[PDB]
């Protein structure tokens, strides 16, 4: 028999993490691994159909993707849908597949709105999410003893599809659900000096533990302004939620990763200011299988798609795709091992949920909600060298914090500042 897999991803634009130019080699590697294994659908062949989820402008749209999905369903009637990754584009496709009772797989779409399983049933998310960031933040607050208040700020841009907005709503909702503490939030313009000045005036009277979502340049400018604004590291702490690590490299383990050096004459001031800043990124796998998979992916992409990939945490997005596909195949086999057909969406979806799998990314666990638990890393500045380094890792399966090589957090006054000062706000 033949198993048809439908893919709805941008085919021309290669600026997205879930672009076809970076997923196609992973998909073909997964297909080759399935064909080379006798315990994964023996005697069956998998075909793939492709569709475009972008308009004439080449960006994610909420109109072209549902139409492409409907046309693919009418023409081929696939058994599973892959993608899309953009939240706006993938939002109607989830409802369409739920109505059609067709399983859907997505390694992106970390929006909190997809967490409602009633409206978005038969949908599996094998990629990173924003609720795990909230869990990590709650664990960090529990470890550090902060239990009074927190502040959240995010930047607004007209280019992106409100990435910081979605990340902040997810983080704030999970913090409210778990820690049930008082948390504030603000939105500021990406490029506005007056907005920056009024924000720096407003910040000291609202809280002490502050999370910021913005571009690396905006974060550097804000920290530089706060350097002479009177804010010091003995009372204020700053966290940068750079999931993909744009300020750093992330791809390689041993490297300096100096974020405050730009050759603009303010390197000394930037280094002095950055002593009270920390960065939260994704966790880089260290097993040699991941390195081999990355090398093969780069070779295949260069050979076929004429695209040159760059080292970083972004490469962790397509790889999970691969792993997720494998998991789905296994589920199908189980159905065929228990008297079923390939069109049993509910049984397959139940089988994949709450299961442990082994892949290039390591030991993945899927809970009952259909969301993969993700790991995070917290960096810190070297007191002597001055270069940032990984100091904390978070395991979401066991929900634990692990130090690296017996490292300790660098505090200017020795201990983390309290949430509320003795004098008060």
């Amino acid at each position: 028999g033949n198993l048809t897999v439908a893919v709805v991803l941008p085919l021309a634009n290669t600026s997205y993490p879930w672009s076809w130019a970076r997923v196609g080699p992973a998909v073909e590697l997964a297909l080759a691994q399935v064909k080379a294994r006798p315990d994964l659908l023996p005697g069956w062949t998998v075909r793939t159909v492709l569709g475009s989820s972008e308009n004439a402008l080449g960006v994610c749209s909420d109109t072209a993707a549902p139409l492409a999905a409907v046309d693919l369903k009418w023409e081929h009637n696939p058994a599973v849908f892959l993608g899309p990754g953009c939240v706006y584009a993938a939002a109607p496709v989830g409802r369409f597949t739920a109505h059609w009772r067709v399983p859907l797989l997505t390694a992106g779409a970390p929006a909190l709105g997809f967490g409602v399983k009633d409206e978005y049933a038969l949908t599996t998310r094998a990629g990173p999410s924003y609720a795990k960031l909230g869990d990590f933040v709650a664990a960090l607050h529990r470890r550090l003893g902060w239990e009074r208040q927190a502040l959240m700020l995010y930047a607004y841009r007209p280019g992106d599809e409100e990435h910081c907005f979605f990340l902040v709503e997810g983080l704030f909702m999970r913090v409210r659900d778990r820690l049930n503490i008082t948390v504030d939030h603000l939105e500021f313009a990406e490029d506005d000096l007056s907005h920056y000045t009024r924000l720096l005036r407003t910040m000291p009277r609202k809280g002490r533990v502050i999370y910021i979502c913005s571009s690396p340049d905006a974060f550097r400018t804000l920290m530089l302004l706060a350097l002479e604004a009177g804010l010091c590291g003995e009372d204020y702490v700053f966290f940068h939620l750079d999931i993909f690590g744009q300020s750093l490299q992330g791809g390689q383990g041993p490297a300096p990763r100096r974020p405050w050096e730009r050759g603009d004459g303010q390197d000394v001031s930037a280094r002095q200011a950055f002593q009270a800043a920390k960065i939260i990124t994704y966790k880089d796998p260290d097993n040699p299988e991941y390195l081999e998979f990355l090398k093969q992916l780069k070779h295949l992409a260069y050979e076929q798609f004429n695209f040159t990939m760059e080292d970083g945490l972004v490469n962790t997005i397509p790889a999970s795709f691969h792993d997720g596909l494998l998991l789905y195949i296994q589920a199908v086999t189980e159905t065929l091992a228990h008297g079923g057909t390939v069109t049993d969406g509910e049984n397959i979806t139940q089988r994949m949920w709450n299961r442990s799998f082994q892949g290039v990314t390591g030991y993945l666990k899927i809970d009952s909600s259909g969301d993969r638990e993700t790991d995070f890393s917290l960096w810190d500045m070297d007191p002597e060298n001055g270069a940032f380094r990984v100091v904390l890792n978070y395991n979401g399966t066991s929900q634990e914090l692990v130090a690296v090589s017996g490292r300790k957090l660098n505090w200017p006054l020795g201990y983390p500042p309290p949430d509320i000062p003795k004098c008060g706000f």
């Epitope: 028999g1 033949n2 005697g43 057909t341 390939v342």
Partner: antibody, heavy 123, light 107 residues
Framework: VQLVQSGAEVKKPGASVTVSCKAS????????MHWVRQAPGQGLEWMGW????????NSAQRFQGRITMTWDTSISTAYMELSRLRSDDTAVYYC?????????????????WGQGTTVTVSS | NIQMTQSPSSLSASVGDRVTITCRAS??????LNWYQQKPGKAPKLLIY???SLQSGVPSRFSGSGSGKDFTLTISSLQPEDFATYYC????????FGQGTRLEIKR
């Protein structure tokens, strides 16, 4: 290969009917076995099938809830039980073999058919 | 599920003619089709499987073609023992049978 059925009984409405189909000339646990009923005028109708090696059963949505299928590997026989009989349950039942089980080829056609069993439900 | 339609309902032809039966599917099925022939009072017999393959022991005059939503069954050089009811059955998921198609002689 041979498939042998038995039964020409008439059952009152609300009773239970059991149909037995025996296989010979081939290994019982190597192929699927489907159950197909045919109304006198409506035509053929599909009900379900059983997977012997994995102990899996499949049933139609309409027939689900009042159908039970069992098999015995020692004598290579299969039994189907239907409860809550109605006036529209009068038809002819066939047991058929089709599709190898080693590679899960459930889409293959049915090449061996039984002689059929006539069941009449009336008061 | 998936509804299957047979065309035409009935037809008449003489010995040695050519007939064609068309089966239509409400949804898209690649090659999940089986053809059965049943005589009155006798069990049905499978002629063509996977819509293109002929079972051993069946005369080569029977032929099958089509894919997607349109399928055709062609019988050439009709014989007196080829007059019966024909059914097209899908096997993608939850197999369902057709309404049947009679085929008799013309007089």
């Amino acid at each position: 290969v041979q498939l042998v059925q038995s039964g020409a009984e008439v059952k009152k409405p609300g009773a239970s009917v059991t149909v037995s189909c025996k296989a010979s000339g081939y290994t019982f646990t190597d192929y699927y076995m489907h159950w197909v009923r045919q109304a006198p005028g409506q035509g053929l109708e599909w009900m379900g099938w059983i997977k012997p090696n994995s102990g899996g059963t499949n049933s139609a949505q309409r027939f689900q809830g009042r159908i039970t299928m069992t098999w015995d590997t020692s004598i290579s026989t299969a039994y189907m039980e239907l409860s809550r009989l109605r006036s529209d349950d009068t038809a002819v039942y066939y047991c058929s073999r089709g599709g190898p089980v080693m590679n899960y080829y459930y889409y293959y056609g049915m090449d061996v058919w039984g002689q059929g069993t006539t069941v009449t439900v009336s008061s | 599920n998936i509804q299957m339609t047979q065309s035409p309902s009935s037809l008449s032809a003489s010995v040695g003619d050519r007939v064609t039966i068309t089966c239509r599917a409400s949804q898209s099925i690649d090659s999940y089709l089986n053809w059965y022939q049943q005589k009155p009072g006798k069990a049905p017999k499978l002629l063509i499987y996977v819509a293109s393959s002929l079972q051993s022991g069946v005369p080569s005059r029977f032929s099958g073609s089509g894919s997607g939503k349109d399928f055709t069954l062609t019988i050439s050089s009709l014989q007196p023992e080829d007059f019966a009811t024909y059914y097209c059955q899908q096997s993608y998921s939850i197999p369902t049978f057709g309404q049947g198609t009679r085929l008799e002689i013309k007089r």
